[PDB]
Amino acid sequence: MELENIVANTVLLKAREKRKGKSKKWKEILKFPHISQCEDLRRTIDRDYCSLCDKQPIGRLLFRQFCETRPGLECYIQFLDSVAEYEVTPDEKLGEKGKEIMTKYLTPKSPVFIAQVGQDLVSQTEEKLLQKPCKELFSACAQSVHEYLRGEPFHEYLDSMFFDRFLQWKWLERQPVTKNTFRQYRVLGKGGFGEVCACQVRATGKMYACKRLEKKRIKKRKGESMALNEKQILEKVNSQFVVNLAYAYETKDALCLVLTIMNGGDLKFHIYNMGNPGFEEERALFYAAEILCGLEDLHRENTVYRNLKPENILLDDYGHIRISDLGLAVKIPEGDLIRGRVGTVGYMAPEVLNNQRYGLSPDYWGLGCLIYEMIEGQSPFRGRKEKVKREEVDRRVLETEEVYSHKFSEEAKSICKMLLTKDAKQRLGCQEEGAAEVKRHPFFRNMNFKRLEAGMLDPPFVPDPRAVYCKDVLDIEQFSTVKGVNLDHTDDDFYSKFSTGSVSIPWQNEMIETECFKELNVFGPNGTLPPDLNRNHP
Numbered sequence: 001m002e003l004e005n006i007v008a009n010t011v012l013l014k015a016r017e018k019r020k021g022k023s024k025k026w027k028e029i030l031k032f033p034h035i036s037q038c039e040d041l042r043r044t045i046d047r048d049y050c051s052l053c054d055k056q057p058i059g060r061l062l063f064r065q066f067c068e069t070r071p072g073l074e075c076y077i078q079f080l081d082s083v084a085e086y087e088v089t090p091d092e093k094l095g096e097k098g099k100e101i102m103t104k105y106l107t108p109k110s111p112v113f114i115a116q117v118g119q120d121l122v123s124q125t126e127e128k129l130l131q132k133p134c135k136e137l138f139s140a141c142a143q144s145v146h147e148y149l150r151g152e153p154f155h156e157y158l159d160s161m162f163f164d165r166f167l168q169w170k171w172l173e174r175q176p177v178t179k180n181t182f183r184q185y186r187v188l189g190k191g192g193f194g195e196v197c198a199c200q201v202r203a204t205g206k207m208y209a210c211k212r213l214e215k216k217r218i219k220k221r222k223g224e225s226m227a228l229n230e231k232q233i234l235e236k237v238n239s240q241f242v243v244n245l246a247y248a249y250e251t252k253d254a255l256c257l258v259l260t261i262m263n264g265g266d267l268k269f270h271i272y273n274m275g276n277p278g279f280e281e282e283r284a285l286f287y288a289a290e291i292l293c294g295l296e297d298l299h300r301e302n303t304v305y306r307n308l309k310p311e312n313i314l315l316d317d318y319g320h321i322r323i324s325d326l327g328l329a330v331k332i333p334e335g336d337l338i339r340g341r342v343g344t345v346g347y348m349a350p351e352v353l354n355n356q357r358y359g360l361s362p363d364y365w366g367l368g369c370l371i372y373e374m375i376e377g378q379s380p381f382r383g384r385k386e387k388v389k390r391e392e393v394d395r396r397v398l399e400t401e402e403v404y405s406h407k408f409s410e411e412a413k414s415i416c417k418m419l420l421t422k423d424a425k426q427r428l429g430c431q432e433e434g435a436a437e438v439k440r441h442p443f444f445r446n447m448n449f450k451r452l453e454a455g456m457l458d459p460p461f462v463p464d465p466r467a468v469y470c471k472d473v474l475d476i477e478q479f480s481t482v483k484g485v486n487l488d489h490t491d492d493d494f495y496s497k498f499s500t501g502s503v504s505i506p507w508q509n510e511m512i513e514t515e516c517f518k519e520l521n522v523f524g525p526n527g528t529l530p531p532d533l534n535r536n537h538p
């Protein structure tokens, strides 16, 4: 054993597990400013109910905490809470759970009666329950509450100390980010214009992955628009099955993307470096399902992926997966095809190999490639450790057909062949339906996709927290030192557009997840103004 490899992992493992890894002076770094400092944000902030009272996590909790100071509003908060529970109760007990809400919030004499719904809607919703139990029964009811809360309660909240406190939180959110903000750990993988390594916010202790983009390498390969495009894409998409962007900042030599940390490792590692090649169909099915949902979300914005291979699918602490490395994705102009000779050897669709125009098709070619590789333990057109000059592997993708073995079930064999059709016109999922045609394939007969997208399905494989499911730090491919490049001011503009600092919603989740919001979000005794919110004197 090499000690660089042992030490690198034990350090990463220690951080991953007092103070939850926070800094000693974290209460000073995240000290609220006096409200008198937040007048600029008070003007800039758009006064939108959905954003300030729901979408933004810390805003959501502060509005709820404000409504809980009034019995006349605490009921509405309890209704929206109960509706959420009803929306995740089993179809078996839906009918029952639907009766408590009605008998507890929707009766003239109920203890927590909410009156702003409408005597017509309560009855309209009352008949719906005798018809059939449905998780979307109270959709109109909960909406009627949002129509009332966004009126007077919202404007009363904007006048209260809780919204002032929100501005204070927003003042910290705006603070600049630098290399100081994080502490870097071992490298987890080579990719793109730099390397991916684990990092940790010093103030909060939350673990992330830092995808480094070396400045000298972007200029030398003219990948500037490609790096920027990756950043925007990661920002626009908000899917449970795609790496989420939390920060994007600049350093003297590189641009950095702070992404969700996936301690479970990539599927390429779980396919080849953990026992026999591939794994059981059960695992492939679950993963194929989540990948489908992740592709479905990327396709809603009409954005192709083109980069689907096992090393770009990752595993989190619980066993779920996310798609990573969106650097090859582009948003499509509606009704047009793109020419791009991009992709990985043995993972490019027949359309891309002929330098031919294509659309959303190459993604479903990749989905089939992954299902096959997970089950068979090898690429559909390349051996496990077989040396082929690119020219032939390419040929095989176009000319030769894949071969299946006893490892494949009838349904697994069927979904693969239907996803691995050379003619993109008659390829599964590439029809006008989109991912709907794929969700119905017999392969997904016991997979309740609606229940998967919610998160009520337990992953089949749970990674052990005290294991690093990755190659050792000294076995990671490295780059060659870039030479002859000098960073000019012409690129200072691109660096500025990229480095936009922290992303609001993820940042707020960081403060909530690490309990920083819990410990710091306090007020005076008896619910009085604390000094940082008192306008008489600091």
Ligand SMILES: NC(=O)c1cn([C@@H]2O[C@H](CO)[C@@H](O)[C@H]2O)c2ncnc(N)c12
Pocket (backbone or CB within 6 Å): 188, 189, 190, 191, 196, 209, 211, 243, 259, 260, 261, 262, 263, 265, 266, 268, 311, 312, 314, 324, 325, 470
């Ligand atoms: N791009 C990313 O978000 C990530 C890439 N890797 C590793 O880097 C490899 C790709 O170079 C993958 O196979 C993983 O082992 C990651 N490992 C952990 N978390 C992440 N967010 C990533």
Ligand SMILES: [K+]
Pocket (backbone or CB within 6 Å): 270, 271, 272, 274, 275, 276, 277, 278, 279
């Ligand atoms: K395996």
